[PDB]
Nucleic acid binder design. Structure first.
Lengths: 56, 110, 46
RNA sequence: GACGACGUUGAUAGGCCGGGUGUGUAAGCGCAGCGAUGCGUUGAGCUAACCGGUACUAAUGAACCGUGAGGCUUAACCUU
RNA sequence: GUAACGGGGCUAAACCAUGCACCGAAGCUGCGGCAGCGACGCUUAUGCGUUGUUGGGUAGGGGAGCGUUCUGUAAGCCUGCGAAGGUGUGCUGUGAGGCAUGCUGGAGGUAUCAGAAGUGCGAAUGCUGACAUAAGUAACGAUAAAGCGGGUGAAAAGCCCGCUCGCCGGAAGACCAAGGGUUCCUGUCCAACGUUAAUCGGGGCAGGGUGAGUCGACCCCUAAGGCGAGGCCGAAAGGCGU
RNA sequence: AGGACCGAACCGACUAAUGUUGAAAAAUUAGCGGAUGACUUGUGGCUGGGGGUGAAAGGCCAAUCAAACCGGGAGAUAGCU
RNA sequence: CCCGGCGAGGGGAGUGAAAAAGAACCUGAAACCGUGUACGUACAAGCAGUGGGAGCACGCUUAGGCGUGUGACUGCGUACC
RNA sequence: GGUUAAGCGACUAAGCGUACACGGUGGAUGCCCUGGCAGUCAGAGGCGAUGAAGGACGUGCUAAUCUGCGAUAAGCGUCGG
């Protein structure tokens, strides 16, 4: 239920060896606006695959 | 030339912020901003504002170029913790630690 | 659950008030002790 | 997490068409009846995860990681 | 779980007998060094020439010392050409320790010989403060339920507006007492407080707001009961009571 | 008529599960008992610690009861840790 | 003056002997948490050290075969009160 | 030089460890004293119905608190300095 000995800095860091994050490998670029966006997502301005999808 | 920016007494634990800092350590400034923009974590918003401040300081104070900059040093230090009381069952009281962090970013053109 | 402190200003002053303390030898000694100690509030009057 | 399928040179999922299954004769109109109801149109209407099909919708061009002939010694072979 | 040589393995690497070698301890010897007790040269105001011998150690006894703060020596000596303290390095002593010096620090420190002690901490489920651990784990407080559009804003699942949905409805509605005491309204702010965000708030700041001959209190009257002139009683305090 | 019957409010607390660093230092949910009476409840009052009160359990007397709490005697004493 | 939400918090400039004295302010120790560099570590079992000891890195060195850090492998070794 | 085979064999660090350097957290240490402790020599040893001790509310160009004062309200008169 509870520990008999105090774990160490080492074991704490070992457990956190799998806690690191992953950065996006690359950002996609739109044909028309040339903006940078997530793949399969729309841009901040509202474009997607150069078709002027929702902007309002 | 080397430039520095800091965010002291930030409302977040260093452990959470360090996860984001490890993503941009040693990266070009242009690439680091794109990483923080699409990192779904609060610490990314804080770190981005610090990085944006360092870039502005270099341009204004050190007359540096942006395309030649690079994140060369970044670290998060533990700040003062705020003590609070959490009422638990059976009259027992627990102590909350609202931890803070000292965020530091260093950019350079080496 | 019903707890121990059910307030009532009347019963508070009639039991621990200034005039109640000043009506007995032992009550007046209570005020003398609190005056010697320097209490800012001697009683529950107000 | 992983594993498997597919990503327009495409049936991966949804939708759509058809069918099947299940429920059991919809609504509307008309007829009979004072009326509740009943009869006819009608095994009708509706029908999830199923079957067989269909690019209508979404699966974007790219980008990223990963390289550039792969150590030393010895023996037998090319030059049994 | 081999599990009745420690193991591998051994037909000698087993047993008996004989003998010669070797390994083997902080034992013995050798080399160097320290200390104690003895005798010796009356040596010397005592250290040796030497000399032999001893030196594991709890309770406990004896002996000799280190360092810390304070007093005198000291209106002296060191010190802004950098004190204490802090942090490193090097040297040194049998040890507690000491000397010097770089960086930090920016004003006190103190020899020697004596004197006095709040004089030395790892432990007492010791005391106080700080910081870890479990752990970025459990949990975020009724399973009445949310969805969308627009607006504001640095940022909106939570705020404002609107259309829907859902819940209470002898209450989860409305008016009061008790109690609390400005939580009421407006504007403004978001650090902290709100178990999340927050432009919102019973949060922060400022300003404003409570109008009575008829409501209530005060007031007149008393109940239980309390106080109680005199008085009765009681060491005192004080008790009972007209 | 009734210390009568069924049953809400109201007063209670027989069973079970949950919870047991709880939502809660005794509760929640589903059932349960009484419910014109020895009933229940508001306001105020009286009884004070070897004393009170008690349809009596050593029960209750401010989350404390085989002798309350606060202060004092007090650095009680401890052949024990 | 600049980034930032007419923010918080910082970077410059300036004051000052000193801003690593900036009001979370003299000195600023330890636990605890981090960034960087060197070495070691993914076929090895246990109070984690000790004795021996390769290699690597670095500083010397009038090559002088020394010093510092690391410690593959190996003998012994079950904390304190 | 080439092919095949056999044998041997470094460069990896997700993370961790030791050392050093630079920092954060924290507030020890040293230095400091308008505060306390214990005394000596002198004083005074009582205040109060001429309303005390101690308090409430008020009082400013004043929003709050402290000090002082009391509707003559951080003060009035007079005698001196």
């Amino acid at each position: 239920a509870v520990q008999q000995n105090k774990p160490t800095r080492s074991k704490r860091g070992m457990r956190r060896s799998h806690d690191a994050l992953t950065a996006v490998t690359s950002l996609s670029v739109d044909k028309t606006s040339g903006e940078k966006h997530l793949r399969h997502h729309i841009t901040a301005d509202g474009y997607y695959r150069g078709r002027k999808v929702i902007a309002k | 030339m080397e430039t520095i920016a800091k965010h002291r007494h930030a409302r977040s634990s260093a452990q959470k912020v360090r996860l984001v800092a490890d993503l941009i350590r040693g990266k070009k400034v242009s690439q680091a901003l794109d990483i923080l923009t699409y990192t779904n974590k609060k610490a990314a918003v804080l770190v981005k504002k610090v990085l944006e401040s360092a870039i502005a300081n270099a341009e204004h104070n050190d007359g540096a170029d942006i395309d030649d900059l690079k994140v060369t040093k970044i670290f998060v230090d533990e700040g003062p913790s705020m003590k609070r009381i959490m009422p638990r069952a059976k009259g027992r009281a627990d102590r909350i630690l609202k931890r803070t962090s000292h965020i530091t970013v260093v950019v350079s053109d080496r | 659950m019903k707890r121990t402190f059910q307030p009532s200003v009347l019963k508070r002053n009639r039991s621990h008030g200034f005039r109640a303390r000043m009506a007995t030898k032992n009550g007046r000694q209570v005020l003398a002790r609190r005056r010697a100690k320097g209490r800012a509030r001697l009683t529950v009057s107000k």
